[PDB]
Design a protein around this ligand. Structure first.
Ligand SMILES: COc1ccc(S(=O)(=O)N(CC(C)C)C[C@@H](O)[C@H](Cc2ccccc2)NC(=O)O[C@H]2CO[C@H]3O[C@@H]4OCC[C@@H]4[C@H]32)cc1
Ligand SMILES: [Cl-]
Ligand SMILES: [Cl-]
Ligand SMILES: [Cl-]
Ligand SMILES: [Cl-]
Ligand SMILES: [Cl-]
Ligand code: NA
Ligand code: NA
Lengths: 99, 99
């Protein structure tokens, strides 16, 4: 698809069998998801946004569908104001920025 | 141009006669620039993201050249850790997400 940016580029994702809404975010290195349960072990990570840092739980090789495209990669979980799909999984679904 | 997302989508911008590097950021509603002076009136605003909120000064009708494309709109200025081109100006240069 071709997505214009007059509105937020929100898409449906599926993770852990659950449907969620997420922002396709070229300004995010990482994929950041609201508090939820994921399988396996996690390791710690500090991510920094506009208003400082938050601690998150990093899970690798998580299976997630994004706007209908399968990805498998790292997802970090923590107190984000919105689910964010960052460049690590945008590259997996073949997304580009064009103008 | 077509920008792949293996790396941060950083471009050169010109604003207020200065050159800066900025992130093309589809996850950003607004265009947020680090502390600088801009001409005209301004009003205070709070904007928030990962970590919390920052106070910024909102300037209207500001022209920015974004990787060679001129665009005009609101720019907010404050203690952001990175210069960000948000959707309010990405739309003006015709930027889209494609996959
Ligand atoms: C109202 O208008 C706004 C409101 C909010 C924002 S924002 O900067 O807070 N953000 C909104 C979003 C979190 C809902 C835009 C994002 O693109 C920021 C943009 C951003 C980038 C860097 C630093 C600060 C902000 N990215 C970001 O926080 O990425 C996080 C997660 O991944 C890491 O990669 C990034 O690079 C490493 C750190 C960040 C980490 C911008 C304009
Ligand atoms: Cl919107
Ligand atoms: Cl979708
Ligand atoms: Cl990954
Ligand atoms: Cl605007
Ligand atoms: Cl358009
Ligand atoms: Na795992
Ligand atoms: Na103005």
């Amino acid at each position: 698809p071709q997505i214009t940016l007059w509105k937020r580029p929100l898409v449906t994702i599926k993770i852990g069998g659950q449907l969620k809404e997420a922002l396709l975010d070229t300004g995010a290195d990482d994929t950041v998801i609201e508090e939820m349960s994921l399988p396996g072990r996690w390791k710690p990570k500090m991510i920094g946004g506009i208003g400082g840092f938050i601690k998150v739980r990093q899970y690798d090789q998580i299976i997630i569908e994004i706007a209908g495209h399968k990805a498998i990669g790292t997802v970090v979980v923590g107190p984000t104001p919105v689910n964010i799909i960052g460049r690590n999984l945008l590259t997996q679904i073949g997304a580009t920025l064009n103008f």
